[PDB]
Design a protein around this ligand. Structure first.
Ligand SMILES: CC/C(=C(/c1ccc(OCCNCCCC(=O)N(C)C)cc1)c1ccc2[nH]ncc2c1)c1ccccc1
Ligand SMILES: CC/C(=C(/c1ccc(OCCNCCCC(=O)N(C)C)cc1)c1ccc2[nH]ncc2c1)c1ccccc1
Lengths: 246, 246
């Protein structure tokens, strides 16, 4: 079980779970101002979501939950998870966002759609902050799993007994990831005082990732994408897998 | 200076800084369905904001900042600060929100304005979570000061030298409040492992306070309050105080 893993085993499992880095799908032989920036980002997000599902299934503790709860967690967290990935990719690219290895965009390119450049600047400031802190890959995968488990855990509909059991388990997994972060920091030599300070600096950036997700979601809902299968159904379909290909 | 305070001195200073608990201003001899719920909450928020300014000036480190930066921090954080106060007041009132000692409202009373009951439920879930964790008053005042200092620190416009110095100072104050939280938890007997776990559980709730603030702000902007002095000017006026009454 998730709750019996050691720190190194948690880290190994999170590292192995990482999704691939995907490419934007545009014709690189054709001009750039043809392309719709929102169309490129939308297509990229849709492909990435399928992989995110595979990733979340490999995060220790996640497939112990109900499919209803798995859907709820991913529905709450998907844009934060995309965003923390984006910021992490972009750390060593000051002033730009690496949406994909063929789609590295600066501030100005942000202006194409009224909205983004606000978000674009928030994302660059976050990447900058991670660069300052010298965020490690092992710390990053802990933080991204924390988002997955934490973002939706305060908005479950019910206090059924099953729901109380599900919340307790989520909170126990989160405690194991905190232990794992502390173990990483100790292993790299920081003092106890530096350990707690760094833990707090990393978790406080998660508040800013939430903010950015909310600002982006505000824009996405305003696009008004007239009757399509709701996100929970699509999540349910990808999550509600059969086992015929095992 | 803020940076030279001990933990006990930080806690004492935060406890002494606490604003008063204000009452809603309605005629308690007259019927309830006369009153506009949004009008009551709006009036309450406006009075509370003046006191919040006084409070923020007493948070160690805050008046070392530029008035521009003080405005920016409060402009980002004011609704989170109101909300964490609300949740704290409501902990020992299961199923209700204590907006004021004469304005304790349940879920159903939330429904008066299309919007709130969504937010209302998030706020009740947060109060419940604090009740579960058995949040202390000393921990609460640390968390509320963290919101004040953290919420806006990733969205400063500039990297002027003065701005870099201001960010470094904010980050040093935040590190002192983390040390203070850890000292509280140690003083109350928790193990080192429990210390870090509790630190993470408290800071992750701040992500949910951000979310709720954003959902509320979405509603407030949609009200479309046609040309009034912008919030930054009003903040500037209360913050940009003379010293003639010293
Ligand atoms: C930060 C940039 C950004 C991104 C973004 C994300 C999602 C977007 O689309 C929402 C989905 N609508 C389609 C619904 C139909 C459907 O699902 N089907 C038919 C299967 C669009 C953009 C985006 C896209 C890809 C990314 N990789 N990493 C990060 C990242 C981010 C963005 C977000 C909000 C506003 C503006 C821009
Ligand atoms: C959670 C409930 C909630 C609250 C709320 C907060 C602020 C509100 O008004 C915004 C200000 N507009 C006036 C602008 C003009 C001006 O400033 N001048 C002329 C000086 C309204 C409500 C509220 C009010 C008082 C509170 N105590 N503690 C918490 C708390 C919260 C709420 C927030 C958003 C949507 C729905 C409800």
């Amino acid at each position: 079980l998730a709750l019996s893993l050691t720190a190194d085993q948690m880290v190994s499992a999170l590292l192995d779970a990482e999704p691939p880095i995907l490419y934007s799908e545009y014709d690189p032989t054709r001009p750039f101002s043809e392309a719709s920036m929102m169309g490129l980002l939308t297509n990229l997000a849709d492909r990435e979501l399928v992989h995110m599902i595979n990733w979340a299934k490999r995060v220790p503790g996640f497939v112990d939950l109900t499919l209803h709860d798995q859907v709820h967690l991913l529905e709450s967290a998907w844009l934060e998870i995309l965003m923390i990935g984006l910021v992490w990719r972009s750390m060593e690219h000051p002033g730009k966002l690496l949406f994909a290895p063929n789609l590295l965009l600066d501030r100005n390119q942000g202006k194409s759609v009224e909205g983004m450049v606000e978000i674009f600047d928030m994302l660059l400031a976050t990447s900058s902050r991670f660069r300052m802190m010298n965020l490690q890959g092992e710390e990053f995968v802990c933080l991204k799993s924390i988002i997955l488990l934490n973002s939706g855990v305060y908005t479950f509909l019910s206090s059924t007994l099953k729901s109380l059991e599900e919340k307790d388990h989520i909170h126990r997994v989160l405690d194991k990831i905190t232990d794992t972060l502390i173990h990483l920091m100790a292993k790299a030599g920081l003092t106890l005082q530096q350990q707690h300070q760094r833990l707090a600096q990393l978790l406080l950036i998660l508040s800013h990732i939430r903010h950015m997700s909310n600002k982006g979601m505000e824009h996405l809902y305003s696009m008004k994408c007239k009757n399509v299968v709701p996100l929970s159904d699509l999540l349910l379909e990808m999550l509600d897998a059969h086992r015929l290909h095992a």
